[model samples]
Target chain A: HMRKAWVKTLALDRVSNTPVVILGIEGTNRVLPIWIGAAEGHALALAMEKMEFPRPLTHDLLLSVLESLEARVDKVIIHSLKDNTFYATLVIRDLTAALIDIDSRPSDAIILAVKTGAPIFVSDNLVEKHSIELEVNERDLIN
Target chain B: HMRKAWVKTLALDRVSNTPVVILGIEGTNRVLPIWIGAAEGHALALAMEKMEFPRPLTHDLLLSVLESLEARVDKVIIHSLKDNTFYATLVIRDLTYEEAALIDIDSRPSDAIILAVKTGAPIFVSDNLVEKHSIEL
Candidate 1:
């Protein structure tokens, strides 16, 4: 129902002083800012900067293991904002190459999406509510 | 607030057969299960088995970024489980190498586990967390 989205930025929200992952939905003025915990944010920032480690961190490790197990990430979708929390699904082709949906935290789903170059989608239902223009861009916040 | 916690294993839940990360408090049979995304489960399993890939995975990349940025993970503690959502923190030092503050930053249990285990930093679950959600099976 919705199009793909991109990681708009990682910023500290004024209200909570907590890090948030801003996702830019393609083809619209919608950018959803989901407050994320620091570790997930750190991992998100690392992937945004395209940093690579000597070994796999959880996201990269998962990506590697998926390959070894013959499973492939088709996409990740942020389907709902139940209360203040976001829910997501990891859509993959498993070992038998059949489609399966694994529930996930939107933050983790986004990280895995970033690592695998998987398309990140926000459901049509949630996008309408988040259409307000979020910041000018990811880099402007630092200045 | 330093308590011993270990990644007991990553397994499927009996109810849904979804992948869940299990952590055990040292010296107790109480274990907490945090359901993970499939990719996360795959990654956790790989970490559990000590498998390697030629290039860095997301978690590995995170480790590299932290080291290059000069940040060290002090500990990761699961401090609460409110409304079935598990909340945790990544206790760290020299976050920016210039910000001289010890930070207990927020984390999901799965992410904390990977960060803690990879860095060999001890993971902790508060007494209340075990009391609140620790289980038998």
Candidate 2:
């Protein structure tokens, strides 16, 4: 099995108003930081804060629709970071126990996880290679 | 050689929605808009919208089935404009010395073209440029 790692959120940027999460992996000494959209970041923050919404948002609606169809979200994977862009997948298991992995935006996946209460997993290799920690007053620049 | 110009559309907030049209050398400047789906726009819009689809669509299915596929979509070139958006192609060529051209959706060229056709103004494409690029790709 591939080594696993969990990156924690250290800081959030307000300029882009996006949520910034820092992940630290065992293999690497450096931490990686990912900048996400404000709405997505807010959803993640709300999830971390354990705040619940009155109505189902888009992600919640999607999960509900999938569940109503007897599908289950098996896992969420942060697959790769290419060209400075992060990519993720939603692994859904069907009635036949077959797994269908669909490509998804990272922010969308985070929101879905919050709604489904699913565990979010990132690859150790990726986290170790890409994670970074931000200085408090680093101008909040994203590359 | 036909004159070509890139037309920009702001209907879609994303930069990908901007459609590029070509005008023929002697044809009218009138623009024709083509409505396309999101998936198609994503595949064809980034570069010139002349590449062939990996799988067959409704149109491609009708032309070929299993064996004895005689006709192939040679090229899709934009000709003239109608209202405000751009129009495009499905140039079919058969093995039996038959050449047929059909008017198709320009948005078929790119995934974002759908957003443009739904809200943005129509644009025109140049025949010469289309002919040149379509063959190279």
Candidate 3:
């Protein structure tokens, strides 16, 4: 089963003081906290703000190339984790209507998902194994 | 007609103090200097240095996507110029090892040049462009 997730918020880990994104799984109290590099975190936060620069950033450029080629991102799949790494893929539909699965890092996938308004899906097993079930008050942090 | 040009160097425009890339036309003393953004210049410089980052940058990511799809960059053509802006195209070929299907995608000269350098693709410039705007090197 696949569950839809949204970027609830971005926060720094109190322990590591590193940037992280909190993905809230829909219809559940579960949330996944994935640590990201500072640069990637900045990109994600900027996209969250709906800001634009005179020159397209790397993520924007990637999206532009796809759009110019008449391809669209169908969805983002955060399907697995191994050795503390979260693996993801971007499902894209090309001109020929073929779905192309492009391997991506979770952070990169999240950026694209935010930009395209594409659904981000987490594997059922991943949520069960790695996600945290938050208390009501704790969930308010996402509010 | 298109002539192959090699990236002679990346430098700043002395007048505007903006980043510029110099492409030297093969078999000629002329060089074309195109102004680009600082970030793009940094990318070009890093590629020139052959440095690797812990994570893939934009150019690396694009290259990886193409490689994974078995597509290769055939060439980069700086084919047009108007209103002092340089226009270029990225000629990409799918199935590099077989009969290639080439496609042209519009791109900024700066971005196209970076990919050209990374992929070992030849960079071509319109012959008229070199004759008109290129500076004597």
Candidate 4:
């Protein structure tokens, strides 16, 4: 119950030109920010924004591959950090209900989370370790 | 030549921050641009990430609904535009239905793309729409 979270939003820090992904718990005020690159950031922003392209991009292709192989993603967890960076695991389930966790980037994990409407969990210790309380203004999402 | 096409990429307009989903044609080397809302962009990006949630999201749920009803997505077409707004159609196959084995439903591009990705369906944009809104990359 205390270990899971979701991608709240993706925003651009204009002055720094850094794209940021914010994660938060349900019915909670605390949130954390992870600085991401322009390409991956746009991918994350696209998911949070809810638009689709003419054909599948990298992530969409990944899902298509999984579905083709008769597999489905169960969940993704931003379980911990590596020095200053965060690490994630993609939990996948096959038709037999078998699952395995694959290592992933925090950015990619959250993108999948938003796509599947799956829950993303950040370890409690990690959230507490480097908590960046994001300002939750409604207008903040558009920018 | 043929009028069908595929998506190349999604980029944000610097001035407006509006998301643009670009489609490219094979023979013509042409690219079409259409502005989309933030939410739909997110939906498309989500599937690419290969993740799923406790409850299926809009597109995810739609796929589930189709499977449950013995229906399958064939493809989606960005077939028309009115004023500045773009339009799409969802073509599906219903095993349960008679004579009318195929069906087309109106949809938004993002939603259509989501369903297409899920079912591995083809996506097409009308040749003229591509020509009208196309820009050089």
Best by TM-score: 3
lDDT of 4 at A64: 57
| Candidate 1: Cα lDDT at B99 | 51
Error of 4 at A44 (Å): 1.6
For model 2, residues A1-143, the per-residue Cα lDDT tens digits are 23333435635675665577764444644455677755456557666676776434334434443543456676777778888778777667665347766666666665566566766677766755765545645424533
Q: Model 4 has how many clashing residue pairs?
A: 23
Candidate 3, residue B92: the lDDT equals 77
Error of 4 at B98 (Å): 34
Query: What's the TM-score of each model vs. the native?
Result: 0.50, 0.43, 0.73, 0.49
Encode model 3's per-residue lDDT on A1-143: one tens digit a residue. Answer: 88999998988777888789889899997899889877678788889998876546667666766765567678998898888888787787775447888777889889988999999999889999999998868777644
Interface RMSD of each: 14.1, 15.2, 3.1, 12.4
Q: For residues B1-137, could you state the per-residue lDDT of candidate 1 as single tens digits?
A: 54688988888887886898888889887788788766567767777777676445556655553443345677888887777677777676664443546655666777788777777889888888777678996
Displacement of the residue B32 alpha carbon in candidate 3, Å: 2.9
- Considering TM-score, which of the candidate structures 2 and 4 is the better prediction for this target? 4
Choose the strongest candidate by DockQ: 3
Q: Write the per-residue lDDT of candidate 4 for residues A27-80, one digit (tens) a residue.
A: 566777888767678777777777777655446645654554456678887777
Which pairs of residues clash in candidate 1, taking residues 3 or more apart in a chain or in different chains? A38-B106, A56-B60, A57-B59, A57-B60, A58-B59, A59-B58, A59-B59, A60-B57, A60-B58, A60-B59
Q: B102, model 4: CA deviation in Å?
A: 26
Which window of ten consecutive residues has the lowest lDDT sum in model 2 chain B? Answer: B58-67
